[PDB]
C-alpha cells in the first residue's frame, strides 16, 4: 500500500531524507529530479545512509567505512559492503512522495 | 612488469581486491589464486560483529564477482615456491608456473603456550571456523575469559556481553589497545567496558590453568567455561624467508608491492611497508590496507605510469555501543577534543597534532568528521588550532576549501 | 648477473665487489662511477696514521685484483631509470646496465650550530675532509671535538700525541653508545681522561665565536678548529628517487638485492638483517663493506653460493688502545678477563645471553678476539666458569669446543 513518506521539497536535489514508516527507516534520495527510495541501513555495519552519507550522482557513500552503493538498484559500487540495498517502489503524487514499504526489492 | 601467468598465494581480502583490479583494469590473461582454507573467500571484520549473533557466513562472503575468469584453488596449500624455476608447489601435488607471483598469505594468531593443555576450551579467533566455534560457545548462563585487551579482545568481549556471558579480561599492559589507539580513547573505552558487565584485569598474566579454573600470576582463580586468546597476529611470511626474500616478521615491499625477489610481490597483513607518517617500515594490520594496497599494486602492474601505494593508514572497531574510527598516528605532542565524551551518549572526535601538523584522528560515533580529517591528514595540514577546537567549525568546509 | 655491470660509488664496498666479480670468474664489462676525483682509498687511516704522516699513496686500495674496469673517477651519478636500464651521469654520459650496484655509503651528519661560525668547522670522512684537519692540528694548538664516536675518539687520541689540546663534549652519558658495551665505554673515558681530554657529557652546543665554541653551559671550549663526529646517514637518494624500499638505507636481502629488479646494494648505504637480533639495521663497518660486497659478487657469479652471513665486527685505534668489538654490546651477563689497566690495558669482555656468547670485546688483546668471533658465530654456550678462568685457552676453546 503506497504511503506518503514526504514532500518533494523535504528532499531536494543531491540531498536525502530518511523516512521512519513504523520502524521501517527508509532512505530517500533526489537525483537531478528523480526519487529513488532505498533501505536506510548500510548492509555492512548498519550505519545510516541518508544521515551522514554522501550522494555523488546516484552513488551513496558510507561515512563509517566509506563503502558505496547505487541508489537506483541498491547495488554496491564499492566494498566493504558485500550485499546490495533492498529498494522500495516510490510514487510522486503532486507534492507528495509515495513509498510502499512492502515490495522492497533486492 | 606484469607477466602472465599471474599466481596469488592466499585467497583473502588482499587477493580478491587485487585480482579484480587486474581484470577490471583490462588484464584478461591467466590468473590462479591459491588458499589453504576451503570456502569461498570471506570478509574477516564481520566475524567480530554479526557472526556471533545470527551466525551467517553467507552475508560476510567476499564477493569475488569482479574477478571473472580467475582460477581459485581453495582447500589447497602452497608448500613452497621456486624463484629460480618460477613455480609454486601445492599440497595437492600440482606445479604452478608464473611470470608474476603475489604473496598475500596474511598473518596468523600467536596462541597461548601457557594454556597449552587446558581442560577448558580456547580459541584464537581468526577464521570462519573459529568464529562459528566461539559464537556457538556463547550461551546465556555461562563464563568466558578473554586473554588480551586489543581490538579482538574488546570486540568479542562486547558481543559476549550481549550474549549474556559474564565476561572478564586479562590485560598484560596497564592500558587497553596499546598498539594503535590514543591514550584518551583507550582510557575511555575501558571505562566504557566496565560499565557493561565486563571484568577487567590490567597488568596481569596467565601463569597457567587448573582443571576448570584460570590462573593469573597473582595466584588468582577464574572459573571460565571458555577462553579466548587475542594476543595478536604474526605474519605468515614462512614461504618468503624460505626462498630468500627480505623478511622481519613480515615481508618488506616498496611502493609498488615489490619484494627483494624478482617477479615476486606481496600485499596485505603479511607485509612490512613504509608508514609515510612515521617513515618506518611497519606491518599494517587493517582491512583498509588489505584492499587499497591490493588495488594500488595490481593497477601499477597493469599501468606503470601510475603511482605506487600512497594512501594513509586507518581502521575501525565496532565494539558494543561504539563505532570507532582511528586514522594515522596514535601519538602527537598535542591533542584536541570535540563533542561529548560520555559512556551513554558518546559522540566525539580526537585530533592528534605534531608541531601544528595533524598526525592523526579518531571518531567515536561521529562518521561525518572522519573523511574530512583524513584528507587533512593526507596533505599533512596544520590548520588553525582554535578553529579545530571550535565546534561551530565544520571540518568538511575546512577540509574541502583551502 | 647481466652485463654490462655498473657499480655506483668507488669506496671499499664497490672495489671489493668488482675485485671479487673478477676473481669469481666474470669476464664481462664493468664500469665503476665515483663522484670524488680520487683513486679508491681507505678511510680508517684518515683519523689514524694519515694524520701521522699524510701520504695519500699510503692509504690506497688494490684495484689490480679487479683488472679491466672502467673507473669513472671524478663523476657523479644523478639517477637511474630501472625501466630503461640506464644511469644518468653529470658528465652527460649515459650508462646502460644489465646489473646495477648501489655502493654509495653515507655522509657525516652536520650540526647547524657551526654553520658559518667564525673558526673552521669540519667532518672527517673524505680525503679533502682530512687534510684541512691535518693542516689545523698544529702541535701547539687547542682543538675541540663533538661526539665521542669512533672518529671523534680516534681523532682525540691522535691529537694528544701531537701535543694538541682536545676537548670532547658528547650529548649522552658515556662514550661509544651506538655499539660498544657500557663496560668498555667507561674504561675509555677514564683512559682518555687520564690522557688530558676534558671529556664532557650530556652537553650540547650553542654559539661559536672564533674561540667561544658552541655550548649550553657558556664555555670557552677554545679552538681555532672543530672536528664534528655526530654519526652518519645513508646516501640512499638515487635509490629513493628510484622508488626502492629505503629508510636511512636501502633494504637488501642476503643476496644484495633491493626491491628493484636488477639493482643491488652494498656496504654502508644498506639496511640488512643482523642475525643476532634478527633486525634490519645499517651495518656501517669496514668488514661488512669488504665482506658483504664479496659475498654478493660470489653468489651473483656462482648460482649456488650461499648468501652473506657474517656477524658484525669492527675495530678502533684510539691512542694506545686497540679496541676490537664483536656482535652486540650487551646481554643478560658479562664476563671480564685479563687486565683492565689505566696505563697498560689488556682485557676481554664477553657478553652472554642465557649462556650463549652474543658479544665480545678485546682491548690490546688480539689473540683472544679471533676465537671469540669463532664461538660467537656458532652460537656456543661454553661453560661460564671456564670462560672466566684466566688459564682457559680461548683458542683451545674455540678450536675444539
Ligand atoms: C576477527 C577480526 C576482526 C577484524 N576487524 C577489523 C576491523 O574492524 N577493521 C579493520 O580495518 N580490520 C579488521 N581486521 C583486520 C583485517 O581483517 C585484515 O587486515 C585483513 O583480513 C587482511 O587480510 P589479508 O588478505 O592480508 O590476509 P588474510 O585475510 O589472512 O588472507 C590470508 C589467506 O591466505 C591463506 N594462507 C596463508 N598461508 C597460506 C599458504 N601457505 N598456502 C595457502 N594459503 C595460505 C590464509 O589461511 C587465508 O586464507 C579484523 C580481522 C579479524 C580476524
Ligand atoms: C675516517 C674514517 C675512519 C674509519 N675507521 C674505521 C675503523 O677503524 N674500523 C671500521 O670498522 N670502520 C671504520 N670506518 C668505517 C668504514 O671505513 C666504512 O664503513 C666504509 O668505508 C664504508 O664502505 P663503503 O664502500 O660502503 O662506503 P664509502 O667509503 O662511503 O664509499 C662510497 C663511495 O660512493 C660515492 N658516492 C656516493 N654517491 C655517489 C654518486 N651519486 N655518484 C658517485 N659516487 C657516489 C661516495 O662519494 C664514496 O666515495 C671509518 C670511516 C671513516 C670515514
Ligand atoms: C586485527 O586483528 C589482529 C589481532 O588483533 P588482537 O588479537 O586484538 O591484537 P592487538 O595487537 O590489537 O592486541 C593484543 C592485546 O593483548 C595484549 N596482550 C599480549 N599478550 C597478552 C597476554 N599474554 N595476556 C593478556 N593480554 C595480552 C597486548 O598488550 C595488546 O593490548 C590484529 O592484527 C588487529 O589489527
Ligand atoms: C665509522 O664512521 C662512521 C661515523 O662515525 P661517528 O661519526 O663517530 O659516529 P658514531 O655513531 O660512532 O658516534 C656518534 C656520536 O655522536 C653522538 N651524538 C649524536 N648526536 C649528537 C649531537 N647532536 N651533538 C653531539 N653529539 C651527538 C652520539 O651519541 C655518538 O656518541 C660510523 O659508521 C663509524 O662506525
Ligand atoms: S557501515 Fe557503511 S561501509 Fe561500513
mmCIF file of N, CA, C and O and ligand atoms in Angstrom, chain C residues 109 111 146-152 169-172 175-178 204-205 229-232 268 284-285, ligand 4:
data_model
loop_
_atom_site.group_PDB
_atom_site.id
_atom_site.type_symbol
_atom_site.label_atom_id
_atom_site.label_comp_id
_atom_site.label_asym_id
_atom_site.label_seq_id
_atom_site.Cartn_x
_atom_site.Cartn_y
_atom_site.Cartn_z
ATOM 1 N N UNK C 109 76.936 13.394 9.449
ATOM 2 C CA UNK C 109 75.830 14.251 9.883
ATOM 3 C C UNK C 109 76.316 15.666 10.138
ATOM 4 O O UNK C 109 77.403 15.857 10.698
ATOM 5 N N UNK C 111 75.870 19.707 11.821
ATOM 6 C CA UNK C 111 75.459 20.423 13.013
ATOM 7 C C UNK C 111 75.272 21.914 12.726
ATOM 8 O O UNK C 111 76.255 22.647 12.596
ATOM 9 N N UNK C 146 83.292 17.323 18.829
ATOM 10 C CA UNK C 146 81.933 16.877 19.072
ATOM 11 C C UNK C 146 81.908 15.351 19.140
ATOM 12 O O UNK C 146 82.811 14.713 18.590
ATOM 13 N N UNK C 147 80.911 14.771 19.784
ATOM 14 C CA UNK C 147 80.706 13.351 19.816
ATOM 15 C C UNK C 147 81.917 12.507 20.110
ATOM 16 O O UNK C 147 82.988 12.617 19.514
ATOM 17 N N UNK C 148 81.739 11.600 21.073
ATOM 18 C CA UNK C 148 82.766 10.622 21.399
ATOM 19 C C UNK C 148 82.574 9.376 20.550
ATOM 20 O O UNK C 148 82.643 8.252 21.041
ATOM 21 N N UNK C 149 82.321 9.576 19.258
ATOM 22 C CA UNK C 149 82.186 8.443 18.353
ATOM 23 C C UNK C 149 83.559 7.987 17.875
ATOM 24 O O UNK C 149 84.531 8.718 18.071
ATOM 25 N N UNK C 150 83.620 6.815 17.266
ATOM 26 C CA UNK C 150 84.811 6.179 16.751
ATOM 27 C C UNK C 150 85.752 7.167 16.087
ATOM 28 O O UNK C 150 86.972 7.036 16.182
ATOM 29 N N UNK C 151 85.207 8.168 15.375
ATOM 30 C CA UNK C 151 86.223 9.032 14.749
ATOM 31 C C UNK C 151 86.552 10.206 15.673
ATOM 32 O O UNK C 151 87.663 10.734 15.616
ATOM 33 N N UNK C 152 85.588 10.576 16.510
ATOM 34 C CA UNK C 152 85.825 11.654 17.475
ATOM 35 C C UNK C 152 86.911 11.214 18.453
ATOM 36 O O UNK C 152 87.845 11.963 18.714
ATOM 37 N N UNK C 169 82.954 17.160 23.988
ATOM 38 C CA UNK C 169 81.611 17.235 24.541
ATOM 39 C C UNK C 169 80.656 16.317 23.781
ATOM 40 O O UNK C 169 80.546 16.439 22.560
ATOM 41 N N UNK C 170 79.988 15.416 24.495
ATOM 42 C CA UNK C 170 79.026 14.487 23.919
ATOM 43 C C UNK C 170 77.658 14.643 24.586
ATOM 44 O O UNK C 170 77.570 15.045 25.746
ATOM 45 N N UNK C 171 76.613 14.324 23.839
ATOM 46 C CA UNK C 171 75.221 14.501 24.205
ATOM 47 C C UNK C 171 74.619 13.346 25.000
ATOM 48 O O UNK C 171 73.416 13.350 25.300
ATOM 49 N N UNK C 172 75.421 12.350 25.346
ATOM 50 C CA UNK C 172 74.985 11.151 26.063
ATOM 51 C C UNK C 172 75.843 10.938 27.299
ATOM 52 O O UNK C 172 76.864 11.626 27.456
ATOM 53 N N UNK C 175 80.670 7.105 26.565
ATOM 54 C CA UNK C 175 81.148 7.169 25.191
ATOM 55 C C UNK C 175 80.552 6.014 24.383
ATOM 56 O O UNK C 175 79.916 5.151 24.982
ATOM 57 N N UNK C 176 80.791 6.031 23.076
ATOM 58 C CA UNK C 176 80.572 4.881 22.218
ATOM 59 C C UNK C 176 79.292 4.099 22.468
ATOM 60 O O UNK C 176 79.392 2.888 22.660
ATOM 61 N N UNK C 177 78.131 4.734 22.481
ATOM 62 C CA UNK C 177 76.847 4.188 22.861
ATOM 63 C C UNK C 177 76.176 3.409 21.733
ATOM 64 O O UNK C 177 75.347 2.532 21.989
ATOM 65 N N UNK C 178 76.535 3.766 20.501
ATOM 66 C CA UNK C 178 75.881 3.182 19.346
ATOM 67 C C UNK C 178 76.128 1.679 19.304
ATOM 68 O O UNK C 178 75.357 0.937 18.699
ATOM 69 N N UNK C 204 75.345 19.571 24.838
ATOM 70 C CA UNK C 204 75.421 20.282 23.559
ATOM 71 C C UNK C 204 75.409 21.779 23.857
ATOM 72 O O UNK C 204 75.126 22.100 25.030
ATOM 73 N N UNK C 205 75.679 22.687 22.990
ATOM 74 C CA UNK C 205 76.073 23.067 21.676
ATOM 75 C C UNK C 205 75.271 24.297 21.228
ATOM 76 O O UNK C 205 74.161 24.178 20.710
ATOM 77 N N UNK C 229 82.011 14.817 14.770
ATOM 78 C CA UNK C 229 81.704 13.415 14.548
ATOM 79 C C UNK C 229 80.417 12.991 15.224
ATOM 80 O O UNK C 229 80.406 12.363 16.287
ATOM 81 N N UNK C 230 79.289 13.341 14.600
ATOM 82 C CA UNK C 230 77.998 13.051 15.220
ATOM 83 C C UNK C 230 77.237 11.945 14.515
ATOM 84 O O UNK C 230 76.016 11.832 14.560
ATOM 85 N N UNK C 231 77.938 11.043 13.823
ATOM 86 C CA UNK C 231 77.162 9.944 13.231
ATOM 87 C C UNK C 231 76.960 10.206 11.754
ATOM 88 O O UNK C 231 77.315 11.282 11.264
ATOM 89 N N UNK C 232 76.416 9.239 11.019
ATOM 90 C CA UNK C 232 76.245 9.440 9.584
ATOM 91 C C UNK C 232 74.911 8.859 9.114
ATOM 92 O O UNK C 232 74.313 8.040 9.823
ATOM 93 N N UNK C 268 77.829 0.584 3.409
ATOM 94 C CA UNK C 268 77.186 1.445 4.398
ATOM 95 C C UNK C 268 75.823 1.980 3.986
ATOM 96 O O UNK C 268 75.067 2.375 4.883
ATOM 97 N N UNK C 284 77.442 -0.360 9.380
ATOM 98 C CA UNK C 284 78.379 0.627 8.862
ATOM 99 C C UNK C 284 79.813 0.342 9.298
ATOM 100 O O UNK C 284 80.432 1.133 10.014
ATOM 101 N N UNK C 285 80.372 -0.789 8.860
ATOM 102 C CA UNK C 285 81.750 -1.131 9.141
ATOM 103 C C UNK C 285 82.563 -1.446 7.881
ATOM 104 O O UNK C 285 82.066 -1.712 6.795
HETATM 105 C C1 LIG D 4 82.770 4.754 11.271
HETATM 106 O O1 LIG D 4 82.460 6.024 10.753
HETATM 107 C C2 LIG D 4 81.080 6.339 10.874
HETATM 108 C C3 LIG D 4 80.875 7.649 11.615
HETATM 109 O O2 LIG D 4 81.421 7.573 12.927
HETATM 110 P P1 LIG D 4 80.928 8.651 14.039
HETATM 111 O O3 LIG D 4 80.568 9.953 13.363
HETATM 112 O O4 LIG D 4 81.919 8.566 15.131
HETATM 113 O O5 LIG D 4 79.528 8.028 14.562
HETATM 114 P P2 LIG D 4 79.182 7.171 15.914
HETATM 115 O O6 LIG D 4 77.804 6.673 15.690
HETATM 116 O O7 LIG D 4 80.185 6.078 16.231
HETATM 117 O O8 LIG D 4 79.137 8.254 17.083
HETATM 118 C C4 LIG D 4 78.375 9.440 17.001
HETATM 119 C C5 LIG D 4 78.369 10.044 18.410
HETATM 120 O O9 LIG D 4 77.823 11.355 18.414
HETATM 121 C C6 LIG D 4 76.843 11.457 19.447
HETATM 122 N N1 LIG D 4 75.858 12.452 19.009
HETATM 123 C C7 LIG D 4 74.685 12.222 18.328
HETATM 124 N N2 LIG D 4 74.077 13.416 18.122
HETATM 125 C C8 LIG D 4 74.844 14.393 18.656
HETATM 126 C C9 LIG D 4 74.688 15.777 18.732
HETATM 127 N N3 LIG D 4 73.603 16.336 18.206
HETATM 128 N N4 LIG D 4 75.672 16.551 19.329
HETATM 129 C C10 LIG D 4 76.773 15.940 19.914
HETATM 130 N N5 LIG D 4 76.907 14.559 19.870
HETATM 131 C C11 LIG D 4 75.980 13.803 19.207
HETATM 132 C C12 LIG D 4 76.318 10.055 19.666
HETATM 133 O O10 LIG D 4 75.759 9.899 20.969
HETATM 134 C C13 LIG D 4 77.570 9.230 19.432
HETATM 135 O O11 LIG D 4 78.344 9.114 20.620
HETATM 136 C C14 LIG D 4 80.449 5.199 11.651
HETATM 137 O O12 LIG D 4 79.811 4.334 10.736
HETATM 138 C C15 LIG D 4 81.644 4.504 12.270
HETATM 139 O O13 LIG D 4 81.410 3.129 12.502
#
